[PDB]
């Protein structure tokens, strides 16, 4: 579950922290919020390797572009570069991204699909929890949201995904990008799924495991 | 559902705002009317990815054309669209209506359907996923219509499409191309539904 919400002086993106192999939760606390550039951040859904790789490659090329032009990078550059790359591979790179940022032009919120289509919106949701998230966004979104309202709406939309979608869970990550300010990345902004104390300690008596051989490994030169 | 209509002063482009994945509406406020030049616009049907990629390339070709040879004709824009659609027909699923205004030629409408063919028409309507309708109320359309008449004609036509179809929906967007300039119109469901 990843969302983007536009507010008066910026854009906020949020995401859940669940990574899965089939029905198994591989990572209970993985980061789906990527820094393309200091004030351009990306939320990624779909193939985990693809979203990371595609975010890092465009992020690298944007950094080089920024040095060459001696200008802060623009979200449309990140958007254009991502969509052209994804289109080239005809959806074989399974990256569904929400691209938000602040640049000299202003604050922007976009979504990109794996086949290379882009949309523009005030609020967007992507991933398996998109329908649960969008239900909340459609119910509570209004024009001229404040920053505090936008963070609450984004986190509530992620919560909807965490609770009602089996694909989404664990904690909520938020990144706030406000015009004329440093982007603030709130890792584990909410932690509503803390494992309860175990009934028993499974610490074993030493010597419990049968050992055939022992040896010292030499890791030095 | 997309259509372009030639009238006395220029040409009007109209479309719906609904983008679908299966039965889910991915975007309910989609802008299907795309600028390839100041007074050359197109309506996009078929794959969202494919139509965007093509429109972005055509815009690049017309920007480069303008730098070297000055303002290009609507026919030229249609030719560039056809070339990309025809040569890449195997890998593409894009149905495009091109509408442009020249001071010499006034309002022109070209349709590039799924084949990759080009057809110059007085008006064009595509519904139900790029299905161009011949006829479509030929008695309802006259040449040298008024701007208000054209807006009413497109508003009704698209309204009927949205009513019968589930692929089409949301708001009705229109772009008016004339000597005066570019005007953007929007009609919300409550206005167009009671038609």
């Amino acid at each position: 579950t990843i969302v983007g919400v536009k507010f008066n002086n910026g854009v906020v993106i949020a995401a859940d922290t669940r990574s899965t192999q089939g029905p198994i939760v591989a990572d209970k606390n993985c980061a789906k919020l990527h820094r393309i550039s200091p004030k351009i951040w990306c939320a990624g859904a779909g193939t985990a390797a693809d979203t990371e790789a595609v975010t890092q490659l465009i992020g690298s090329n944007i950094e080089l572009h920024s040095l060459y032009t001696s200008r802060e990078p623009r979200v449309v550059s990140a958007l254009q570069m991502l969509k052209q790359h994804l289109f080239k591979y005809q959806g074989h790179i399974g990256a569904y991204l929400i691209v938000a940022g602040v640049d000299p032009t202003g604050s922007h919120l976009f979504s990109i699909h794996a086949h290379g289509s882009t949309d523009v919106g005030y609020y967007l949701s992507l991933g398996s929890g998109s329908l649960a998230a969008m239900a909340v966004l459609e119910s509570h979104w209004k024009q001229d949201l404040t920053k505090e309202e936008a963070i609450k709406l984004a986190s509530d939309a992620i919560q909807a995904g965490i609770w009602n979608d089996l694909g989404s869970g664990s904690n909520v990550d938020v990144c706030v990008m406000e015009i004329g300010k440093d982007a603030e990345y709130l890792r584990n902004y909410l932690t509503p799924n803390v494992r309860e104390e175990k009934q028993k300690s499974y610490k074993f008596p030493r010597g419990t495991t049968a050992v055939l051989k022992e040896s010292i490994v030499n890791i030095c030169d | 559902s997309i259509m372009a209509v030639t009238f006395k002063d220029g040409v009007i482009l109209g479309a719906d705002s609904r983008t679908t994945t299966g039965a889910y509406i991915a975007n309910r406020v989609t802008d299907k009317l795309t600028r390839v030049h100041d007074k050359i616009w197109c309506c996009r049907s078929g794959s969202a990815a494919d139509t965007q990629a093509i429109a972005d390339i055509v815009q690049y070709h017309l920007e480069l054309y303008t730098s070297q040879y000055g303002t290009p004709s609507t026919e030229t824009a249609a030719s560039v669209f056809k070339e990309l659609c025809y040569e890449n027909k195997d890998n593409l699923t894009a149905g495009i209506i091109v509408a442009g205004y020249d001071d010499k030629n006034k309002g022109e409408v070209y349709t590039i359907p799924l084949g990759g063919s080009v057809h110059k028409l007085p008006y064009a309507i595509a519904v139900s996923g790029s299905t161009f309708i011949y006829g479509y109320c030929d008695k309802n359309f006259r040449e040298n219509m008024s701007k208000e008449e054209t807006v009413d004609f497109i508003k009704h036509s698209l309204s009927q499409a949205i009513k019968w179809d589930g692929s089409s929906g949301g708001v009705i967007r229109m772009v008016v191309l004339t000597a005066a300039g570019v005007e953007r119109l929007i009609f919300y469901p409550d206005e167009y539904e009671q038609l």
Partner: peptide, 5 residues
């Protein structure tokens, strides 16, 4: 899935 009037 892909998006597609």
């Amino acid at each position: 899935x892909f998006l597609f009037x």
